[PDB]
Amino acid sequence: EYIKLKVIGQDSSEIHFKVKMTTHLKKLKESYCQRQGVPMNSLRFLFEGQRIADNHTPKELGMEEEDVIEVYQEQCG
Amino acid sequence: LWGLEAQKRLRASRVLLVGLKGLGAEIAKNLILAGVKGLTMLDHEQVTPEDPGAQFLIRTGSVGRNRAEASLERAQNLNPMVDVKVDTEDIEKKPESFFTQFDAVCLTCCSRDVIVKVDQICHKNSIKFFTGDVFGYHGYTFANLGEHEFVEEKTKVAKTTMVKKKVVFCPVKEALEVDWSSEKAKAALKRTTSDYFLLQVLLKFRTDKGRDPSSDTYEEDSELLLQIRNDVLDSLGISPDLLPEDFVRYCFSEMAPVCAVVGGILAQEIVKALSQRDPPHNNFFFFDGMKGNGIVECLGP
Amino acid sequence: SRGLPRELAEAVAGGRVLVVGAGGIGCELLKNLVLTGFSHIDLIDLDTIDVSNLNRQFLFQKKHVGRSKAQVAKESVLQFYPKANIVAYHDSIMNPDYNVEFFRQFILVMNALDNRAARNHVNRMCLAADVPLIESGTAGYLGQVTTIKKGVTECYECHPKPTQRTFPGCTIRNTPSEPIHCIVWAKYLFNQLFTKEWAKSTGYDPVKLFTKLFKDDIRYLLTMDKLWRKRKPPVPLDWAEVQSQDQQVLDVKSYARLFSKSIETLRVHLAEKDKDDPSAMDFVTSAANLRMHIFSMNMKSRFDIKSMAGNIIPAIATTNAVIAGLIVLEGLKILSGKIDQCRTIFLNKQPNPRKKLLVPCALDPPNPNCYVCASKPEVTVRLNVHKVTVLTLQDKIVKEKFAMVAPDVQIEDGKGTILISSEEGETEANNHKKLSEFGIRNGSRLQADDFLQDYTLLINILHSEDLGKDVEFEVVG
């Protein structure tokens, strides 16, 4: 089964992903990183306060339909 | 017509700030630098021996002088374009006519009863209401803007443009006197931070003792706070085990860093409200400087 | 100056702390420290003050314009607490004077910087000193605070930093380091025009305005050699000199003419009674590149400046207050011996689904692969050996990219031939010479030491004559 996930950045920005529940979340992270034009380990992705690792899946993390993934990015200013 | 109109709306606004201790100092400094049309600092109290330091707008050598009066020079010096004013009279005996000259009113150091009254006055006269206090490592802000309209730009959504939005706030009395016997409130209870109920405890202290808990009388205040903890939580249908005993040792006096944090958030909320540019935090902001939590709760409805 | 338990208060009153940077965050931090009971504070900042009611500073006012940031911050705070022992340095933290011995004086170091190269240096200095470092940053409503401790947490360089696409506007810059500081200055100058009001007196003369902020103002900055002793001095310009001798980077004469062209065009706009119109952007391109040339900085094209200028996030002073307050609160836990309670704290614009505006996060352990804080760190660089010289290696590959300050470089071969010497007057003649003349090519290894930073980096070389347009070196791994 597929699940649509909301990925919300610090600036209230929002991107929606539709991802296979058994597929590693590394794909979602590398896709989002490509959209922001930033390197792989440049941001952190949290779900329920837990850091989403490359080999994590929605099934393993009990992710529901329309659940929110939070993005955090270091400010150098 | 543009975000430039939000700029001129702020620069035409007059704010009333009550209470010129640590938190009020921070709020004044922030709002003045921002460029409000003017700010009126209201305090009835005089500078005490332990005030010139902790309050950076007060000069060393001002003990015995009115706290708001002694703040004026430093406060004005920050921005000559701001109309910085003082009021030495008591807020509790201030007529309703006085408030109508201000776009926003921000209360610090006031008793619950003064908080509710002034809030009720603002709503009657469409004035924007704010309150906030610091207690040790804890600090909070509350807003009541009633029917509030703002223009926030919404970032692109793909799988940026401006949009008008209306948010409805509620009176402080409803926000403070929440009924927890309801079915909706029971499920809300688990999600509600214990800092809300801590606020309830400290308000009762302030109303009864005429002051906040202090480092000088730690042991007596600490005993009364535990007594109030039971008398407030049990009188709400909530098991008094939500606030642990160790809460007493983290809510005394005014931590300068906490004023910095809570004064920074509150001031910005005042700015947002007056400019009508960004979505103001709906209702409460609770900060615990020991845990690094900044929570926005919506209570009252 | 008490508000917290005896052990902590005596720790705070007796300890000594370092604040690096005296801008928005710094000035707020300083106040927060003195009001908390920190009585021994060192404050360093290289820059001088430039302020106007276009953007207003906490401790900095019009009477302070042209003076040291750190000194004025010290003087301003001394008026609140007369008893604080504050040492102000008008200098760069990358001055070799501020060595490991200097850093061991402090029980806590707090960052308040706007650039990467300096942050990198402090990171390494703090690891070498074995001293807790509190790292902070801000942009608009957003910002974070974190804690770096050797052998416990990740260093400032354990993870790749997002390459800056959007630029946080900070408290007005006077001495340019990055090319963005000139674009901010030009954008700041543009909205300060369209002696403070010299244009309204000379009749918008593009030649008279040229000879004031690009002649006198910078010659006035040369009176103080506090920065100009080990760091590269700025070169003043005269209008009569410049006359004498699209993504295209142009020469100084053209930007001086476009400067006079922009002023000739924009004054027609002023006659009546924004950044989109070409003439407005033509000013920004000129006044910036002009300052860029003065401060030994490579000039940028219109295309690059256009997108950069559009990416400037406006400053929100209230956010810097929040962060400076969070820093001190993290400081208190460390000096309390409760580092295990420290958190990486992110600030949001709006509350998240979990109703959180401040988001605390567990501190991450050291990255075993980090090229800085790991034991025996090693990298790999691909470059053209027949084109790139030792000077290009030193100033743009060893010092710029890998952020070294006083490096010493020798070739790995069981001989140790000194290519680069930090000690002046040893390998000075090697600069112009090509790297291949020293027997360096594919497979060669370079052991670079920065004894100031107390840091060894092993550099692997892979040679390639093909790199592309405007490519000199490429980091691989």
Ligand SMILES: *NC[C@H](*)CS(=O)(=O)NC[C@H]1O[C@@H](n2cnc3c(N)ncnc32)[C@H](O)[C@@H]1O
């Ligand atoms: N992004 C947040 C705003 C940054 S700031 O608060 O304005 N601080 C900038 C301030 O720090 C100084 N700085 C930068 N690099 C420095 C070195 N190497 N040494 C000393 N100070 C240094 C700048 O001078 C700015 O004033």
Ligand SMILES: [Zn+2]
């Ligand atoms: Zn590291």
